[PDB]
Amino acid sequence: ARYLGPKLKLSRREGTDLFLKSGVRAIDTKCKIEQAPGQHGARKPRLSDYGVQLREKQKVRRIYGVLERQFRNYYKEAARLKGNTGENLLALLEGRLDNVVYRMGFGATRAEARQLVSHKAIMVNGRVVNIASYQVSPNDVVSIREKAKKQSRVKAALELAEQREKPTWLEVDAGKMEGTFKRKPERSDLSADINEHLIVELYSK
Amino acid sequence: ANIKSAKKRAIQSEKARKHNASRRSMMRTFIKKVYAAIEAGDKAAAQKAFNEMQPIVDRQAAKGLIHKNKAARHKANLTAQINKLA
Amino acid sequence: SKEKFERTKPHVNVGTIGHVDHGKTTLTAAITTVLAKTYGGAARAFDQIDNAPEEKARGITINTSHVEYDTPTRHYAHVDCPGHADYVKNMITGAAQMDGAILVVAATDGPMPQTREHILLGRQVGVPYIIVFLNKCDMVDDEELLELVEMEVRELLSQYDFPGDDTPIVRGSALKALEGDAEWEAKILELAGFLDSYIPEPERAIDKPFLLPIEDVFSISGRGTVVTGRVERGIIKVGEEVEIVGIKETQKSTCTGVEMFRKLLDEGRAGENVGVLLRGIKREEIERGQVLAKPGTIKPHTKFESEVYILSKDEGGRHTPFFKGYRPQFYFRTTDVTGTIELPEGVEMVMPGDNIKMVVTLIHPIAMDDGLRFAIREGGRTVGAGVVAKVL
RNA sequence: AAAUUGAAGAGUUUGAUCAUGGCUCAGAUUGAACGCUGGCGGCAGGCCUAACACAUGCAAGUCGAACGGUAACAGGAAGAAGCUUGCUUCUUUGCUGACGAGUGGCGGACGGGUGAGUAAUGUCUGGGAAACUGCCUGAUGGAGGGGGAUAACUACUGGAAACGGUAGCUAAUACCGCAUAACGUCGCAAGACCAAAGAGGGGGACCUUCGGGCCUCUUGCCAUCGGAUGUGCCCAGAUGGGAUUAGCUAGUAGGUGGGGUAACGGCUCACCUAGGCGACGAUCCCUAGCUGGUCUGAGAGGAUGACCAGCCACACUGGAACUGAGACACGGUCCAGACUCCUACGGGAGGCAGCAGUGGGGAAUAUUGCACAAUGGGCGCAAGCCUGAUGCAGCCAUGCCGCGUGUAUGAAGAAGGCCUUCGGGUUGUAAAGUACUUUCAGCGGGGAGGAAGGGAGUAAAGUUAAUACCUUUGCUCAUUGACGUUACCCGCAGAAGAAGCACCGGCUAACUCCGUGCCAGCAGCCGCGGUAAUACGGAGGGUGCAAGCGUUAAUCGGAAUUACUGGGC
RNA sequence: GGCCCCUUAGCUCAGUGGUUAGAGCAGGCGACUCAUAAUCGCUUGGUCGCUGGUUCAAGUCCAGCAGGGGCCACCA
Numbered sequence A: 001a002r003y004l005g006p007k008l009k010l011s012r013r014e015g016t017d018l019f020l021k022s023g024v025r026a027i028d029t030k031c032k033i034e035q036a037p038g039q040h041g042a043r044k045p046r047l048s049d050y051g052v053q054l055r056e057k058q059k060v061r062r063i064y065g066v067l068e069r070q071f072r073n074y075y076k077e078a079a080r081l082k083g084n085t086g087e088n089l090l091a092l093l094e095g096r097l098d099n100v101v102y103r104m105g106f107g108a109t110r111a112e113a114r115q116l117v118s119h120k121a122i123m124v125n126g127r128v129v130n131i132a133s134y135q136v137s138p139n140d141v142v143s144i145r146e147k148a149k150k151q152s153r154v155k156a157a158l159e160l161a162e163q164r165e166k167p168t169w170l171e172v173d174a175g176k177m178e179g180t181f182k183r184k185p186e187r188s189d190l191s192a193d194i195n196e197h198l199i200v201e202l203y204s205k
Numbered sequence B: 001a002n003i004k005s006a007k008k009r010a011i012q013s014e015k016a017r018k019h020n021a022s023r024r025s026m027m028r029t030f031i032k033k034v035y036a037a038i039e040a041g042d043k044a045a046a047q048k049a050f051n052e053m054q055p056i057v058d059r060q061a062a063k064g065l066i067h068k069n070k071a072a073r074h075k076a077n078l079t080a081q082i083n084k085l086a
Numbered sequence C: 001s002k003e004k005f006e007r008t009k010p011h012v013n014v015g016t017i018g019h020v021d022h023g024k025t026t027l028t029a030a031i032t033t034v035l036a037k038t039y040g041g042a043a044r045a046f047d048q049i050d051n052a053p054e055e056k057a058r059g060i061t062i063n064t065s066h067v068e069y070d071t072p073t074r075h076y077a078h079v080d081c082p083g084h085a086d087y088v089k090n091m092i093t094g095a096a097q098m099d100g101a102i103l104v105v106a107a108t109d110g111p112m113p114q115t116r117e118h119i120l121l122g123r124q125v126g127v128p129y130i131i132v133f134l135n136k137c138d139m140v141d142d143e144e145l146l147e148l149v150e151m152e153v154r155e156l157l158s159q160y161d162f163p164g165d166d167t168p169i170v171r172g173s174a175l176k177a178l179e180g181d182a183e184w185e186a187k188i189l190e191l192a193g194f195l196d197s198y199i200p201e202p203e204r205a206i207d208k209p210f211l212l213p214i215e216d217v218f219s220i221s222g223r224g225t226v227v228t229g230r231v232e233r234g235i236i237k238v239g240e241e242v243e244i245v246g247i248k249e250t251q252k253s254t255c256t257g258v259e260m261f262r263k264l265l266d267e268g269r270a271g272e273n274v275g276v277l278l279r280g281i282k283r284e285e286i287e288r289g290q291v292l293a294k295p296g297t298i299k300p301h302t303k304f305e306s307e308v309y310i311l312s313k314d315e316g317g318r319h320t321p322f323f324k325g326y327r328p329q330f331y332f333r334t335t336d337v338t339g340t341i342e343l344p345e346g347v348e349m350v351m352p353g354d355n356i357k358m359v360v361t362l363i364h365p366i367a368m369d370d371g372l373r374f375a376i377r378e379g380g381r382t383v384g385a386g387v388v389a390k391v392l
Numbered sequence D: 001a002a003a004u005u006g007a008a009g010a011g012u013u014u015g016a017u018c019a020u021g022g023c024u025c026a027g028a029u030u031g032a033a034c035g036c037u038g039g040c041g042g043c044a045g046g047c048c049u050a051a052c053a054c055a056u057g058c059a060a061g062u063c064g065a066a067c068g069g070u071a072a073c074a075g076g077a078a079g080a081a082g083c084u085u086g087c088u089u090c091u092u093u094g095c096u097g098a099c100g101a102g103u104g105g106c107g108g109a110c111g112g113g114u115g116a117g118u119a120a121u122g123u124c125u126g127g128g129a130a131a132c133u134g135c136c137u138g139a140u141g142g143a144g145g146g147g148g149a150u151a152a153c154u155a156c157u158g159g160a161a162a163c164g165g166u167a168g169c170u171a172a173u174a175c176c177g178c179a180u181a182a183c184g185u186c187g188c189a190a191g192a193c194c195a196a197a198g199a200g201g202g203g204g205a206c207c208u209u210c211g212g213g214c215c216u217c218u219u220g221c222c223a224u225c226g227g228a229u230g231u232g233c234c235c236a237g238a239u240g241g242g243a244u245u246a247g248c249u250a251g252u253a254g255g256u257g258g259g260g261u262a263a264c265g266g267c268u269c270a271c272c273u274a275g276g277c278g279a280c281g282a283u284c285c286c287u288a289g290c291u292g293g294u295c296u297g298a299g300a301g302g303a304u305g306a307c308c309a310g311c312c313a314c315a316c317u318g319g320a321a322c323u324g325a326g327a328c329a330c331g332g333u334c335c336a337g338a339c340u341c342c343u344a345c346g347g348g349a350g351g352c353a354g355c356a357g358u359g360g361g362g363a364a365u366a367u368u369g370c371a372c373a374a375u376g377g378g379c380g381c382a383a384g385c386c387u388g389a390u391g392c393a394g395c396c397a398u399g400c401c402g403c404g405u406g407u408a409u410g411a412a413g414a415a416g417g418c419c420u421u422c423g424g425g426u427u428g429u430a431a432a433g434u435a436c437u438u439u440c441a442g443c444g445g446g447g448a449g450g451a452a453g454g455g456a457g458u459a460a461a462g463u464u465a466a467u468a469c470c471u472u473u474g475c476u477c478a479u480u481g482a483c484g485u486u487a488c489c490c491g492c493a494g495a496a497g498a499a500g501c502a503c504c505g506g507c508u509a510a511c512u513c514c515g516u517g518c519c520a521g522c523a524g525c526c527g528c529g530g531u532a533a534u535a536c537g538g539a540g541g542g543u544g545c546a547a548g549c550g551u552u553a554a555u556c557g558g559a560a561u562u563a564c565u566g567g568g569c
Numbered sequence E: 001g002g003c004c005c006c007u008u009a010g011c012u013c014a015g016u017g018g019u020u021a022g023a024g025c026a027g028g029c030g031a032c033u034c035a036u037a038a039u040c041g042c043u044u045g046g047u048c049g050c051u052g053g054u055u056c057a058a059g060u061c062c063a064g065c066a067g068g069g070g071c072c073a074c075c076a
């Protein structure tokens, strides 16, 4: 129930970096970003409205690494809440455990954080949680178990993390390896490269 | 009957039927005696037949063979008709 | 409901063969009668064996029949076989599970064509021992032609590598023994003694994966499909899980009951002749010639090459060679399948009585492994035998 | 505070146009089935068809504290061999615990299954009066004295069996009169009439044939009036289709009198009157269990009643009553029928739409499993016994949900496939190579919760003549788990054991080469194929979903295409 | 498990042992057409279900098997 194929193809097809590698190297030296994958790569399409809506939805899904059934459940939840559907959907994707573990610089990629969480190396409030989609609430403390403080992966990720823009809703202590929420991010705290109204128009057909 | 509790119930029910039939027969006998005495036209014979009848229906109701309302019905009808004639 | 079967003596499988109307079923009934009279409880009558309506009408044997008896040293399961030339497949299926046969020859007739055919097939299938019983001695009272019959039987047996000068022969009459004549009943006990002494105790391999060749299928009311046969190797326990591997596609099942002569068991070992009750199997889903095996042990195949000998004259055989495109029948265990032949490059004409390396392809898969013996037959004529060499 | 945030179109009639009007597509859902493929777990669900026919084992018993008793078992006693002088053997004893059969009480009308029949004798909503009600509960009363039987048992005897018969004997909370009777019944009154049963524990003093009397405590017994629960009856409105079904009705509509019922009533009879229903759809024909609810929809509506809960009806087919507080009675009785059996030929036996299981029908649907540890039920003062209800386990990708099948780096942009303007492009950081991790599966070691109670002793307070018995409240002491190798935790080795299906002309996301040549073939709708096919078949590349993916069947939406909201001649 | 029937070209059917196994309807090639139908000129075809026997001679006679149809049993 995971995607286990080549990763640069997805960013090539979306025509935009998806932060899907570590970041030690500029992605110009790794793939030819300007081309779509395959034999008919340089050829260009003329997308319709269905095409652009589908591409936007796929791009968000590949960013966060969620499959279609559970994404549909997320949309239904966000539509059930009281507010704006796009804001709720983006905040709801931003609250799952592996995204938070990546977001405070413990894994180099989202798959790093996925394997860290799945292999019983993370605690929330002094309790082991082994599930990626775990929604984390405000005023929660996320930490690495004492048994897992000696791997080189964690400090390599920590050294890759501080050369990146700091999230304004997490508080991190690298020496103790602790992190704490304050509250959920707002729309202005996330990238403006995403139009969620296309998502809503695709799922509210 | 293929369970060793229905056979006992069948035997007991047959005995109880045989027991109840005779009491019902005697009670009906006395009732129709009073009815015949009324039909004849005499008034004293009807009265003494009714006086002989009344304890029988009272006791038979008390033993569960009939209901109190049945005995009261019989007594009421017979009293009404007996006092009707001259 | 049902009683239980207890194991107290070594168990042996025997049976009867011979020409038609020489007295096989009468002997089969007489043995049980006399033994039960002395000790036991068998008492299995003549019409209790030939029970099917056509058998009762035409007065012959069409199927094979199973009876049981026991001397106070052994426990015998006995198989009675037909004697007609066009029931031979049933006789082969019955004789594939014999530890030793009894050859019935009538003194009035002598050896006959079916006697020789049965002897030859017992050679080619692998029956280890043969006892000779000479029947209808009440008819013939001369003591000179009996020598002629005995001699002729002796060289007939010897010609097919069976030990002729050493095999025992018994005179008697099954009709008189069954009637109750105390004089002739001694010959039955002499036959029983030779049956106890000449046949040794065979070896049973009970440390190998379980395997059972299916030979007959029944539907028991209230219970389901039952398959019978003789356990080749291993052990089967109630509750264990089995594989039906054979000429159809493979199936999975579970064992839910084992019995031996209608007596309840709890597990069947090698050498017994048992019926096994399967769970959730329909009666047209299964058939004679399949294999009931331990899962993931044996496999089916269709194409293979082998080493084989061809019979010659004065042995049945053929009086003419064969070439490519030849399609005879191959007998494996309790099965016969048509197959297409491929001779090695060169050596086209095949002499009647040589060896050869041939490749063969079957029309249905067979549960097969190297070092498996088979026979070759067509049109009422046995022609050879071989050993599975390599499987492709 | 919140209990609401609600409505989208596209293809196809023409040389092109506008309108009208049908067909088809994009969504959600299922007791699904088939094809290809398939790692683990949690929670659910699983004969829709033949209410067809059924082998075998289980699904309803319990009380000795109502009774006479002793077939079995264990204790006690008295005679009794032997020696370790009574160690050990034997026999007679219901004396004790207990208890097969028998009389008696209660339960078997509950619990479990199925949807054949039934368009209203049923169901839903709202009301009413002419009634009964075991076990539970409140109040006021009583609870005296007699009798005749019988089962078991003994003797004889019939029958293949199931099962009987004749003669003796005995007990009771079994059965039947008498006495007493009121707020009970009948009657205007005066009056007349009706019932009952004993057992169990302990004991100071007093008489004991010395069995008991006597005191005390507990539980049962009868009558009457209440409470609560259940059940019977009446009325109004609503609850499919057909007018190519328009007339129907003789106990039929009403009245009087006799009977009947727990109770009102043509409920039933005799007589009198001539009425009663119907276009607001009677009568007849077809189909069908009803509801809370379920799917869809912006709503109004449309389709539907599988699992869970309330009501109804049925129990091989057709009738009938008996017993009881309650039945016209799933594992009861009687009679008739068709099937399947046993028989000594005279006669007998049976009913899976209970839980498993078999054959048959079908496109299609599961184990002849474990336990009464928990909840609930029957009997018992209790201990306890019974429970295919129930609690669990097995099978099945049938559905919903969660997780895994590694992770970072890696240009030689390697080999090999494919395309090529012969320069190169693409698969592609993909692989190999390097450095890390160990969830799940495998092996070893620890380890919650589902358990409340019941038993023994002791202490105090109640009761009383009584520190005895009994009840209530505390404490102490040993125990009660089918699931089960539980959930979960700790350690070990190693990337090691784990990815498929549909599609790529437009609708609709995704393009080229070869083979064939209106042939072979494809298709939901328009439509492709006649020698240069993005549409057929294979290959390379790509798109969408993912332990699933496609196809078929069925419903609503789009459909304002039955139009009340909301259409026309 | 036993017994009894059928199998000739693409389709529907003849052919009773004497040696190229035939008829009709269909089909193939050349001229015309972008391609056909029609018109003109030439025409090719079978595993006689398969394997093995008897006969100088087998589609034909004798057996076994494969595929399909129809009757009858046996019940650890």
Ligand SMILES: Nc1nc2c(ncn2[C@@H]2O[C@H](COP(=O)(O)OP(=O)(O)CP(=O)(O)O)[C@@H](O)[C@H]2O)c(=O)[nH]1
Pocket: C019, C020, C021, C022, C023, C024, C025, C026, C027, C059, C060, C061, C062, C081, C082, C083, C084, C135, C136, C137, C138, C139, C172, C173, C174, C175, C176
């Ligand atoms: N005089 C005599 N007659 C005998 C003897 N044995 C058999 N028979 C006769 O032969 C007849 C047939 O014998 P049977 O035993 O049936 O022979 P079979 O071998 O079973 C024939 P199939 O091969 O079909 O089974 C019987 O009816 C019997 O009367 C014997 O020893 N003596």
Ligand SMILES: *C(=O)[C@@H](N)[C@@H](C)CC
Pocket: C066, C228, C229, C259, C260, C261, C262, C273, C274, C275, C276, E076
């Ligand atoms: C029954 O199953 C057994 N006695 C025999 C018949 C098996 C061959």
Ligand SMILES: [Mg+2]
Pocket: A001
């Ligand atoms: Mg999933």
Ligand SMILES: [Mg+2]
Pocket: B055
């Ligand atoms: Mg009196």
Ligand SMILES: [Mg+2]
Pocket: C020, C021
């Ligand atoms: Mg003969």
Ligand SMILES: [Mg+2]
Pocket: C021, C022, C106, C108, C109
């Ligand atoms: Mg003979």
Ligand SMILES: [Mg+2]
Pocket: C024, C025, C026, C060, C061, C080, C081, C082
């Ligand atoms: Mg025979």
Ligand SMILES: [Mg+2]
Pocket: C058, C059
């Ligand atoms: Mg004969």
Ligand SMILES: [Mg+2]
Pocket: none
């Ligand atoms: Mg002869």
Ligand SMILES: [Mg+2]
Pocket: D012, D013
């Ligand atoms: Mg059109």
Ligand SMILES: [Mg+2]
Pocket: none
């Ligand atoms: Mg056009």
Ligand SMILES: [Mg+2]
Pocket: D012, D023, D024, D525
């Ligand atoms: Mg159309």
Ligand SMILES: [Mg+2]
Pocket: none
């Ligand atoms: Mg649809």
Ligand SMILES: [Mg+2]
Pocket: none
């Ligand atoms: Mg399937």
Ligand SMILES: [Mg+2]
Pocket: D047
């Ligand atoms: Mg069925």
Ligand SMILES: [Mg+2]
Pocket: none
């Ligand atoms: Mg049904």
